[PDB]
């Protein structure tokens, strides 16, 4: 729950993206992105049927002001319908294989360094 700055030095930066929960029967990642145009300058947003979607900005700026003060706000549909979304900075999630990602891995035992 707690993040932190010592344990790995980056390398990739990313373009950084977080994900929404809580989109409306009929909806679109077109009309999210004009609900999360407040946060700033969007670059990215998708929305997946299953109900969850996600969203790019800019600068990390938008991004952890639309974590921060578009959490938890209801969304509008152009269709005239309003549903609670929650926004959150996409971190440790991977459906995928489990692999040791913030445990430790031992390290010191590989072929490279």
């Keep these: ?14 373009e950084n993206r977080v994900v929404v929960s ?13 609900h999360m145009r407040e946060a700033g300058d969007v670059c990215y947003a998708d929305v997946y049927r299953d109900g ?6 800019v600068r990390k700026e938008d991004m952890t002001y639309a974590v921060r003060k578009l ?3 209801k ?7 309003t549903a609670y979304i929650r926004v959150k900075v996409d971190g440790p ?10 445990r430790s891995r031992s390290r010191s035992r590989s072929l490279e360094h």
């Design 75 to 81: 969304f509008r549909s152009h269709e005239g319908e």
């Design 52 to 57: 969850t979607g996600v969203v790019e900005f």
């Design 1 to 14: 729950m707690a993040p932190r700055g010592r344990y790995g030095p980056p390398s990739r930066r990313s």
């Design 71 to 73: 959490d938890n706000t």
């Design 93 to 102: 999630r991977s459906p995928s294989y489990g692999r040791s990602r913030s």
């Design 22 to 34: 809580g989109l409306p029967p009929s909806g679109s990642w077109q009309d999210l992105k004009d």
